[PDB]
Amino acid sequence: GLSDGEWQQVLNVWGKVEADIAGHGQEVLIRLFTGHPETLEKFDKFKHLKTEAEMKASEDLKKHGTVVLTALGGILKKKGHHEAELKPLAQSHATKHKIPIKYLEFISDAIIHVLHSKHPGDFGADAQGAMTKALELFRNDIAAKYKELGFQ
Ligand code: HEM
């Protein structure tokens, strides 16, 4: 649960992402894969990437970063009223992709890391607080659907 002022911070931060969605999405995925190599094994279409240079050169990885961040941005713009947008993603990630909730924690922290890396000194303490709370709400509502499905 976020206040109006917190949602305003989230959507202000998101404007930074929307100016270069593919570059942000690329770096989020590279941070996830290099920090947590077990996550790469969930992607049949990326498991061939062995080095970070290959990851950086991959146009399909940048494409997938755009897909991921476009979906997240659509959810965030709902300011918590995201049941319809979140349900299919929870269902596909539990039943088809088999993504443990831990990996959604990993990607949440990776988003925070990338924002500081690309906007150093321009991602203030209030903005980090609000973004973190928004990613926690997203993860928590996915977790409720995972529990319904019995997925661990
Ligand atoms: C911010 C969180 C994330 C968002 C918004 C997101 C969004 C999406 C979207 C929109 C798709 C395509 C449609 C679908 O299959 O439902 C997708 C596919 C996928 N997601 Fe996620 N995702 C997230 C986190 C992750 C994480 C943490 C993992 C794994 C570590 C992951 C693994 C996958 C895989 C395996 C696919 C299928 C890729 C394919 O082969 O083309 N997702 N995701």
Q: Which domains does the chain have, with CATH numbers?
A: 1-152 (1.10.490.10)
| Helices then strands, each counted (H, E), the chain | 7, 0
Phi-psi region of 102 (alpha: psi -120 to 50; beta: other; left: phi over 0): alpha
The residue among 152, 137, 38 whose CA lies nearest residue 79 is: 137
CA of 120 to the centre of ligand 1 (A): 27
CB count in 10 Å sphere of residue 106: 16
CB 95 near ligand 1, within 6 Å = no
Resolution of the structure, angstroms:
1.4
> What does 18-82 look like in DSSP terms, one character per residue?
HTTHHHHHHHHHHHHHHH-GGGGGG-TTTTT--SHHHHHH-HHHHHHHHHHHHHHHHHHTTTT--
If 0-12 CB within 10 Å is exposed, 13-18 middle and 19+ buried, where does residue 94 land? buried
Report how far residue 17's alpha carbon sits from residue 115's, in angstroms, rounded to the nearest whole number: 8
CB 42 near ligand 1, within 6 Å = yes
36 is in an annotated binding site: no
Q: Report the structure determination method.
A: X-ray
CA distances to 13, 15, 18, 84, 107 from 141, rounded to whole Å, are 22, 24, 24, 12, 16
Report how far residue 125's alpha carbon sits from residue 112's, in angstroms, rounded to the nearest whole number: 11
Tokens of 17: 């992402």
Contact 25, 66 (CB under 8 A): yes
